[PDB]
RNA sequence: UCUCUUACUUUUAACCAGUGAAAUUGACCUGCCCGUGAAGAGGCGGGCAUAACACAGCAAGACGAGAAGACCCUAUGGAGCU
RNA sequence: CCUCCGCAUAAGCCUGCGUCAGAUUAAAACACUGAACUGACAAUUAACAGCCCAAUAUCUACAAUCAACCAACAAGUCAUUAUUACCCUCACUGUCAACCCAACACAGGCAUGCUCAUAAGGAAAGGUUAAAAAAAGUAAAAGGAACUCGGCAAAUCUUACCCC
RNA sequence: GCUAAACCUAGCCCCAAACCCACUCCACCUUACUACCAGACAACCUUAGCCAAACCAUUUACCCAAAUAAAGUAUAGGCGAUAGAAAUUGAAACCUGGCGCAAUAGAUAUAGUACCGCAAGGGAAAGAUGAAAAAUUAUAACCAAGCAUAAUAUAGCAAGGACUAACCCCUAUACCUUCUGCAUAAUGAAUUAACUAGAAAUAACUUUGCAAGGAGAGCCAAAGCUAAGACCCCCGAAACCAGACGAGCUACCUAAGAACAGCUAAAAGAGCACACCCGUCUAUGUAGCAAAAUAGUGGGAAGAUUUAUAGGUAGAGGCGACAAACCUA
């Protein structure tokens, strides 16, 4: 026979059946956004259209992205938005010579950061990319605040962002005693930001952990039915009672 | 046997003693709980990716230094979801023959009466 | 007493747990069904016990109580009057004793009867107001009864004398509970004088 | 041995069915129904085949096409199978080429 | 009891008890010669030697001596229409030894009946058959054949 | 090479009702005679209409 | 080859197999050094047997006895023919106070005595 | 071993009783000589022979049975190795 | 008359010549009734053997071979102490057979202990006859390798030389 | 007249519709189906190849948005086999069926059972009374091959012409395939029953409809356009690739064991010689006792020995006192 939904559907029929369509609505949606990264291992097309050679005629043209693999030492990482290439190439650049299989790598380098919302030091593992977009954005702060998760490329990324997230957000006292002027100053360098703050938790979370956390959100041990009934009868008795 | 029907009375009064005792016992822990299924458990699912009610098993050290326990897999490793999919086709064809089958009966018994 | 039967069984005049039955339908037999009228159970009228009308075969208009109702198959036995003749005594040297034995008939070779003209008619189910439900003759209008008939348990309740291991009405039928908060196991414990003073100590439940 | 012994059951055809009845009835909708619908539109079936005829190569990579992503596993191993035969034979095989 | 989770004891804590037990023994004839004092069980799977000898002394008041068992396998050789293999069930049996110079023979249950009451269901199709048969066995080699039944 | 024979039959009848059952075989005669009519030594010799 | 569909019972391996195995029949005790097995008399189920002399209840019943309409016990039914007569008079003279439900029967926490009810301490 | 073989015993054998395979088989009412012919005939031409039917042997023929020749060649069919 | 067998343990197997009934049938390479079976009933009883141990430090140079002289090399198969903790006890499992791996009731394969011909265990001939051919033996006049590729085989106990 | 024969209905298939399942108690990741104890390891990765290109070496449709049309067009390509879009267009909510199979068919299915395999894995066969079998009655026979009733008669592809007569007379070199050509002593076939092998386009031809227009959008058109009819087989390698499963045989190794009488003992990878390991030569056997055995005869038998148990190394590999040896006949 055939299937009621087609098989590619299932994964958002889950999403809509159970604990999943308990999780919260912006969680939700941000799961289902599903955004395009930008440009890092191939140049875009500028236009929508283009003329070509050999004939004078506008003809449209799309960018179409190359499938980078990214191996769980970036998720660890803080790369850029880049990964590896596992492609193939041709011997001396020319079609009719061996289709060999190629795999390029980036540079990867050990380097030492400062969050002024963390007031800690991350020793992590980067490369030129993510320096420079750091450098672009004024500061390790910006940059992960500003990136979004299909550019950040790193669930360490992604959960540094929660944690400066949930510090603006709650407003804690995040430097330390006998330094609120200070702690106000790094508080209002980010004001475009800080997400309220039951929205700021669920930030940077895989399904699982999702899951997870609305799991135990709804503990709940049940209650005995004693109380139950003794609230029901004690009602009745001062219906009864009060006619 | 003289009446062997003696033995399936006996049986079945003791079974209706046991329901009763169980039943008295099921009220009593609900009222003082909240609880059924006296046996604490939790729906898991297993290494073969289905979904078990897996009940406890009392023991008398905490389960992250119990070895043995930490050897079974309570998670999936996806490459048992093909397979998955592939039982629950197994089980819509076994359904679908079934009403087929009833529909036919049923429209043999309409045509002869 | 629990035996689960094949999913085409043929229900064949002897019950399914008889040394009979056994023989005629041993698990390795497979044959073609027979298919029956499908009627629910609240609108078979006749039971074991009532008088029928047998409206054809090799006696026809003549009047019969029926004997044995057999449901998986729509029959009902009438009491020795659609009858062929048999042998029971078999023998290698002499064979006998033959009797007349009935054979089953469809409900729409009988019809219902009712006490006052003695005549066939049809049933209708009609609930009463007052509670219970009972059937309505059709062109008349009367109440025809539930006959009548000793039960499956083989007994009479009236000549009934208690024996030596049944319990009587009355102390069987005493109450003796009271309801508390108590389980079974403290109630025993305490009317026995069980006293148990070291406690019950932290498990690991997973 | 190979024939019956015996004639088989009479088989009554009732001509004065519903269905033969009515069969051809709302026919010609579109020609006298001022072409608010199509004959083609009453035909029932497979959703990939209503108003189409096609091949038997053109049926499977029209199943494919329009169902074949809510089908079964086996059944769509089945059809790719199906298809790459029925390619090779229909564009290699035969004769008159 | 049977089919049922154990309270996990702990050191220093209380005793393990059974309210209603779960476990039924059959009081078997054996298949060979034994000691007078000699009573043999079939006991279920679960029970042993200790949980035995309590059943015997608690329920029974039967002063017990000596608790052995064994445990006997059920043929596995039977096979079914579908070439099937038929198992008889495991089980186990126990040899328990008497006490205080008990001994104990096993009873002679089924002899023996002498009953002779009046029957309607089965006894008069009995006479039936009876009194058919010593009236209908008159046969005579005399005639060879001829049907010993018309007057003439 | 595995097949073995069939039909185990028995060619007796037996008294299979009584041993359980809720109704009973339905009698249309009996065993004997209630009591024979002895008849008179010398009915041929009164064969006449009466003496 | 090996039998595959026979159940794998303690009757089957090398030396080793059987004795590891076992029937089904639960620990009373545990081994030590030299072998020797230490039963421990709390590990043994001790079968609670009451006393039938005066007892007048036979294990059937009287086909004279009147048939009735079944009816489950709930926790419910039990809570109305257990606490609610209490705590009606109770209310009824002013003394309910909803804060302390122990002398009504109700217990906070199950872990304090014996017979615990939900993690079942008890046997049977 | 042989000139140069012989005698006996056991097995096998043959007959009687019981149980009871396999390769093979277009159909066969299935002869010899000469000739012929896809070039080596039981079956064709010319002659000759010729009641029917078991059992035990033998191995000249049935280009005898077995294995779609391994030798040789061919295939824009393979594979191992250098 | 045979025994080069056998009895145990291990491993393997898993009720597989115990009783009763059916033997009308059915496998018995035929039969009686029991190894090539149907149903029911019954049995293997622990002392033998499995199933073990509270930590933390610490100790552990000198083979075995009658272990004594002597003699070696390939250099070896076995051990504690100190302190703390600890006073309940005999559970559970295997226990049968004419038996396992070889499609078989298969001249094959199968570890260890014990007597190495037995106190264990077994039967080469269904009956007859006395053909050929064939197989395994025994004996053989005179000769003694003349056989044959070759002393293959058999019988006797055997000298010398060569190649690798 | 034996063996047999025959039978409808279990079920199945293809659609439609609808998103579907799973704790009575107990046990089950250790040797699964095991009541009860102290290192807490852990998954995320471009398929390849057959095949086509008549070789092969770049290349060769197969991916999961309802249709249709644009269009097999633009494009790609040893520019060659072949590969091949998009913009744009527009895609009417409800109805429980069958010119499907009927026991060699239809699911492998009575069952993933029996059986085979160490394992992954492979994988069967089959049933038929009647209202009642609590009718065992007498009917229902008739029909394949194989036989029996009932062996045979000079001579010859088995018959045909005939004839008063079965034979005798006369005439006559089975069939299929393959070939220049076969009675060929070339292939295949014991025989019966059942099953078992021609699938479609461009363009033409015929027959209708309408007609400078045809067609139910798109397309064609200097009589065309629309519609129909008619049309291109079956079995078979040695291969290649991916992923699993295998060292209970065997090769080598690791751990911890066991065995080796007697005599000569030169001291001994010494000699004779048992058990034990191997397999020189002969004979038998060759569908055998045996998918490598038996009898005799032989080589070794305190060592580089033989051997029980558990473990390890695996196929683009392992292991090898290199035999292209062995890695479940
Ligand atoms: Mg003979
Ligand atoms: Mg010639
Ligand atoms: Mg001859
Ligand atoms: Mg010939
Ligand atoms: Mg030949
Ligand atoms: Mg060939
Ligand atoms: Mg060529
Ligand atoms: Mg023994
Ligand atoms: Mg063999
Ligand atoms: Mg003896
Ligand atoms: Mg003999
Ligand atoms: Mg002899
Ligand atoms: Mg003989
Ligand atoms: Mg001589
Ligand atoms: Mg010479
Ligand atoms: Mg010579
Ligand atoms: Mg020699
Ligand atoms: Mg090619
Ligand atoms: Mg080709
Ligand atoms: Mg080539
Ligand atoms: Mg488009
Ligand atoms: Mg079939
Ligand atoms: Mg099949
Ligand atoms: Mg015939
Ligand atoms: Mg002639
Ligand atoms: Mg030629
Ligand atoms: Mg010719
Ligand atoms: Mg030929
Ligand atoms: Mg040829
Ligand atoms: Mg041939
Ligand atoms: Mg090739
Ligand atoms: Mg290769
Ligand atoms: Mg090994
Ligand atoms: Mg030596
Ligand atoms: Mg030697
Ligand atoms: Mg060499
Ligand atoms: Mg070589």
């Given at each position: 026979?055939?299937?009621?939904?087609?098989?590619?559907?299932?994964?958002?029929?889950?999403?809509?059946?159970?604990?999943?369509?308990?999780?919260?609505?912006?969680?939700?949606?941000?799961?289902?956004?599903?955004?395009?990264?930008?440009?890092?291992?191939?140049?875009?097309?500028?236009?929508?259209?283009?003329?070509?050679?050999?004939?004078?005629?506008?003809?449209?043209?799309?960018?179409?992205?190359?499938?980078?693999?990214?191996?769980?030492?970036?998720?660890?990482?803080?790369?850029?938005?880049?990964?590896?290439?596992?492609?193939?190439?041709?011997?001396?650049?020319?079609?009719?010579?061996?289709?060999?299989?190629?795999?390029?790598?980036?540079?990867?380098?050990?380097?030492?950061?400062?969050?002024?919302?963390?007031?800690?030091?991350?020793?992590?593992?980067?490369?030129?990319?993510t320096?420079?977009?750091?450098?672009?954005?004024?500061?390790?702060?910006?940059?992960?605040?500003?990136?979004?998760?299909?550019?950040?490329?790193?669930?360490?990324?992604?959960?540094?962002?929660?944690?400066?997230?949930?510090?603006?957000?709650?407003?804690?006292?995040?430097?330390?005693?006998?330094?609120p002027?200070?702690?106000?100053?790094?508080?209002?360098?980010?004001?475009?930001?800080?997400?309220?703050?039951?929205?700021?938790?669920?930030?940077?979370?895989?399904?699982?952990?999702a899951?997870?956390?609305?799991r135990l959100?709804?503990?709940?041990?049940?209650?005995?039915?004693?109380?139950?009934?003794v609230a029901?009868?004690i009602?009745?008795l001062?219906?009864?009672?009060?006619? | 046997?003289?009446?062997?029907?003696?033995?399936?009375?006996?049986?079945?009064?003791?079974?209706?003693?046991?329901?009763?005792?169980?039943?008295?016992?099921?009220?009593?822990?609900?009222?003082?709980?909240?609880?059924?299924?006296?046996?604490?458990?939790?729906?898991?699912?297993?290494?073969f990716?289905?979904?078990?009610?897996?009940?406890?098993?009392?023991?008398?050290?905490?389960?992250?230094?119990?070895?043995?326990?930490?050897?079974?897999?309570?998670?999936?490793?996806?490459?048992?979801?093909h397979?998955?999919?592939?039982?629950?086709?197994?089980?819509?064809?076994?359904?679908?023959?079934?009403?087929?089958?009833?529909?036919?009966?049923?429209?043999?018994?309409?045509?002869?009466? | 007493?629990?035996?689960?039967?094949?999913?085409?069984?043929?229900?064949?005049?002897?019950?399914?747990?008889?040394?009979?039955?056994?023989r005629?339908?041993?698990?390795?037999?497979?044959?073609?069904?027979?298919?029956?009228?499908?009627?629910?159970?609240?609108?078979?009228?006749?039971?074991c016990?009532?008088?029928?009308?047998?409206?054809?075969?090799?006696?026809?208009?003549?009047?019969?109580?029926?004997?044995?109702?057999?449901?998986?198959?729509?029959?009902?036995?009438?009491?020795?009057?659609?009858?062929?003749?048999?042998?029971?005594?078999?023998?290698?040297?002499?064979?006998?004793?033959?009797?007349?034995?009935?054979?089953?008939?469809?409900?729409?070779?009988?019809?219902?009867?009712?006490?006052?003209?003695?005549?066939?008619?049809?049933?209708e189910?009609?609930?009463?107001?007052?509670?219970?439900?009972?059937?309505?003759?059709?062109?008349?209008?009367?109440?025809?009864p539930?006959?009548?008939?000793?039960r499956?348990?083989?007994?009479?309740?009236?000549?009934?004398?208690?024996?030596?291991?049944?319990?009587?009405?009355?102390?069987?039928?005493?109450?003796?509970?009271?309801?508390?908060?108590?389980?079974?196991?403290?109630?025993?414990?305490?009317?026995?004088?069980?006293?148990?003073?070291?406690?019950?100590?932290?498990?690991?439940?997973? | 041995?190979?024939?019956?012994?015996?004639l088989?059951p009479?088989?009554?055809v009732?001509?004065?069915?519903?269905?033969?009845?009515?069969?051809?009835?709302?026919?010609?909708?579109?020609?006298?129904?001022?072409?608010?619908?199509?004959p083609?539109?009453?035909?029932?079936?497979?959703?990939?085949?209503?108003?189409?005829?096609?091949?038997?190569?053109?049926?499977?990579?029209?199943?494919?096409?329009?169902?074949?992503?809510?089908?079964?596993?086996?059944?769509?191993?089945?059809?790719?199978?199906?298809?790459?035969?029925?390619?090779?034979?229909?564009?290699?095989h035969?004769?008159?080429? | 009891?049977?089919?049922?989770?154990?309270?996990?004891?702990?050191?220093?804590?209380?005793?393990?008890?059974?309210?209603?037990?779960?476990?039924?023994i059959?009081?078997?004839?054996?298949?060979?010669?034994?000691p007078?004092?000699?009573?043999?069980?079939?006991?279920?799977?679960?029970?042993?030697?200790?949980?035995?000898?309590?059943?015997?002394?608690?329920?029974?008041?039967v002063?017990?001596?000596?608790?052995?068992?064994?445990?006997?396998?059920?043929?596995?050789?039977?096979?079914?229409?579908?070439?099937?293999?038929?198992?008889?069930?495991?089980?186990?049996?126990?040899?328990?030894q008497?006490?205080?110079?008990?001994?104990?023979?096993?009873?002679?249950?089924?002899?023996?009946?002498?009953?002779?009451?009046?029957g309607?269901?089965?006894?008069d199709?009995?006479?039936?058959?009876?009194?058919?048969?010593?009236?209908?066995?008159s046969?005579?080699?005399?005639?060879?054949?001829?049907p010993?039944?018309?007057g003439? | 090479?595995?097949?073995?024979?069939?039909?185990?039959?028995?060619?007796?009848?037996?008294?299979?009702?009584?041993?359980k059952?809720?109704?009973?075989?339905?009698?249309?005669?009996?065993?004997?005679?209630?009591?024979?009519?002895?008849?008179?030594?010398?009915?041929?010799?009164?064969?006449?209409?009466?003496? | 080859?090996?039998?595959?569909?026979?159940?794998?019972?303690?009757?089957?391996?090398?030396?080793?197999?059987?004795?590891?195995?076992?029937?089904?029949?639960?620990?009373?005790?545990?081994?030590?050094?030299?072998?020797?097995?230490?039963?421990?008399?709390?590990?043994?189920?001790?079968?609670?047997?009451?006393?039938?002399?005066?007892?007048?209840?036979?294990?059937?019943?009287?086909?004279?006895?009147?048939?009735?309409?079944?009816?489950?016990?709930?926790?419910?039914?039990?809570?109305?023919?257990?606490?609610?007569?209490?705590?009606?008079?109770?209310?009824?003279?002013?003394?309910?106070?909803?804060?302390?439900?122990?002398?009504?029967?109700?217990?906070?926490?199950?872990?304090?005595?014996?017979?615990?009810?939900?993690?079942?301490?008890?046997?049977?």
């Amino acid at each position: 026979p055939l299937h009621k939904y087609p098989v590619w559907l299932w994964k958002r029929l889950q999403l809509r059946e159970g604990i999943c369509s308990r999780l919260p609505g912006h969680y939700l949606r941000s799961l289902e956004e599903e955004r395009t990264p930008t440009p890092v291992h191939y140049r875009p097309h500028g236009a929508k259209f283009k003329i070509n050679p050999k004939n004078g005629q506008r003809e449209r043209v799309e960018d179409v992205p190359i499938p980078i693999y990214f191996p769980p030492e970036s998720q660890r990482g803080l790369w850029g938005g880049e990964g590896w290439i596992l492609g193939q190439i041709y011997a001396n650049n020319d079609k009719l010579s061996k289709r060999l299989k190629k795999v390029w790598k980036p540079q990867l380098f050990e380097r030492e950061f400062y969050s002024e919302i963390l007031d800690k030091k991350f020793t992590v593992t980067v490369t030129m990319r993510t320096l420079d977009l750091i450098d672009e954005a004024y500061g390790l702060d910006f940059y992960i605040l500003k990136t979004p998760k299909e550019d950040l490329c790193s669930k360490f990324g992604m959960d540094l962002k929660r944690g400066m997230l949930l510090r603006l957000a709650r407003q804690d006292p995040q430097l330390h005693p006998e330094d609120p002027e200070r702690r106000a100053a790094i508080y209002d360098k980010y004001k475009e930001f800080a997400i309220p703050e039951e929205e700021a938790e669920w930030v940077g979370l895989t399904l699982e952990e999702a899951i997870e956390k609305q799991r135990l959100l709804e503990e709940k041990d049940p209650v005995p039915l004693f109380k139950i009934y003794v609230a029901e009868l004690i009602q009745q008795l001062q219906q009864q009672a009060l006619s | 046997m003289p009446s062997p029907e003696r033995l399936d009375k006996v049986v079945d009064s003791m079974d209706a003693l046991d329901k009763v005792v169980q039943e008295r016992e099921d009220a009593l822990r609900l009222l003082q709980t909240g609880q059924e299924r006296a046996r604490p458990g939790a729906w898991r699912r297993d290494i073969f990716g289905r979904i078990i009610w897996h009940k406890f098993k009392q023991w008398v050290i905490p389960w992250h230094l119990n070895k043995r326990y930490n050897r079974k897999r309570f998670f999936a490793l996806p490459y048992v979801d093909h397979f998955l999919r592939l039982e629950r086709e197994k089980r819509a064809r076994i359904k679908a023959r079934k009403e087929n089958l009833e529909r036919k009966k049923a429209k043999i018994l309409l045509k002869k009466f | 007493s629990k035996v689960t039967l094949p999913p085409h069984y043929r229900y064949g005049m002897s019950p399914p747990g008889s040394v009979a039955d056994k023989r005629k339908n041993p698990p390795w037999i497979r044959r073609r069904p027979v298919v029956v009228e499908p009627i629910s159970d609240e609108d078979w009228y006749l039971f074991c016990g009532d008088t029928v009308e047998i409206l054809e075969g090799k006696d026809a208009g003549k009047q019969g109580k029926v004997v044995q109702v057999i449901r998986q198959r729509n029959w009902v036995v009438v009491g020795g009057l659609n009858t062929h003749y048999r042998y029971i005594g078999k023998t290698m040297d002499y064979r006998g004793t033959m009797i007349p034995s009935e054979a089953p008939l469809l409900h729409r070779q009988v019809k219902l009867v009712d006490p006052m003209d003695r005549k066939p008619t049809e049933i209708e189910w009609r609930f009463t107001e007052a509670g219970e439900r009972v059937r309505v003759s059709t062109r008349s209008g009367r109440i025809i009864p539930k006959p009548e008939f000793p039960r499956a348990d083989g007994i009479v309740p009236e000549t009934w004398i208690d024996g030596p291991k049944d319990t009587s009405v009355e102390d069987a039928l005493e109450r003796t509970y009271v309801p508390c908060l108590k389980t079974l196991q403290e109630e025993v414990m305490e009317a026995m004088g069980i006293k148990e003073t070291r406690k019950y100590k932290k498990v690991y439940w997973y | 041995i190979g024939i019956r012994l015996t004639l088989p059951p009479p088989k009554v055809v009732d001509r004065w069915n519903e269905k033969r009845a009515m069969f051809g009835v709302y026919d010609n909708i579109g020609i006298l129904g001022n072409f608010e619908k199509h004959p083609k539109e009453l035909i029932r079936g497979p959703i990939w085949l209503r108003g189409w005829k096609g091949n038997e190569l053109q049926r499977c990579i029209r199943k494919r096409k329009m169902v074949g992503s809510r089908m079964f596993a086996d059944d769509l191993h089945n059809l790719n199978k199906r298809i790459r035969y029925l390619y090779k034979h229909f564009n290699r095989h035969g004769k008159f080429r | 009891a049977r089919n049922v989770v154990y309270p996990l004891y702990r050191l220093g804590g209380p005793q393990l008890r059974v309210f209603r037990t779960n476990f039924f023994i059959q009081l078997v004839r054996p298949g060979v010669a034994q000691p007078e004092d000699t009573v043999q069980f079939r006991i279920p799977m679960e029970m042993t030697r200790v949980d035995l000898r309590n059943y015997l002394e608690g329920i029974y008041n039967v002063p017990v001596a000596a608790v052995r068992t064994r445990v006997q396998h059920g043929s596995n050789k039977r096979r079914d229409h579908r070439n099937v293999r038929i198992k008889k069930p495991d089980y186990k049996v126990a040899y328990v030894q008497l006490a205080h110079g008990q001994t104990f023979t096993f009873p002679d249950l089924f002899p023996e009946k002498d009953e002779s009451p009046e029957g309607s269901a089965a006894d008069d199709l009995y006479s039936m058959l009876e009194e058919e048969r010593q009236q209908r066995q008159s046969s005579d080699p005399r005639r060879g054949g001829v049907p010993s039944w018309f007057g003439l | 090479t595995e097949k073995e024979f069939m039909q185990h039959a028995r060619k007796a009848g037996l008294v299979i009702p009584p041993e359980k059952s809720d109704r009973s075989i339905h009698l249309a005669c009996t065993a004997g005679i209630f009591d024979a009519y002895v008849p008179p030594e010398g009915d041929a010799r009164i064969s006449s209409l009466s003496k | 080859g090996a039998d595959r569909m026979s159940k794998w019972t303690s009757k089957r391996g090398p030396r080793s197999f059987r004795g590891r195995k076992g029937r089904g029949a639960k620990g009373i005790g545990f081994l030590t050094s030299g072998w020797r097995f230490v039963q421990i008399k709390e590990m043994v189920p001790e079968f609670v047997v009451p006393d039938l002399t005066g007892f007048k209840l036979k294990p059937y019943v009287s086909y004279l006895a009147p048939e009735s309409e079944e009816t489950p016990l709930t926790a419910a039914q039990l809570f109305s023919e257990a606490v609610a007569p209490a705590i009606e008079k109770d209310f009824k003279d002013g003394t309910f106070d909803p804060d302390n439900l122990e002398k009504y029967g109700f217990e906070p926490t199950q872990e304090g005595k014996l017979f615990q009810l939900y993690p079942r301490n008890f046997l049977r």
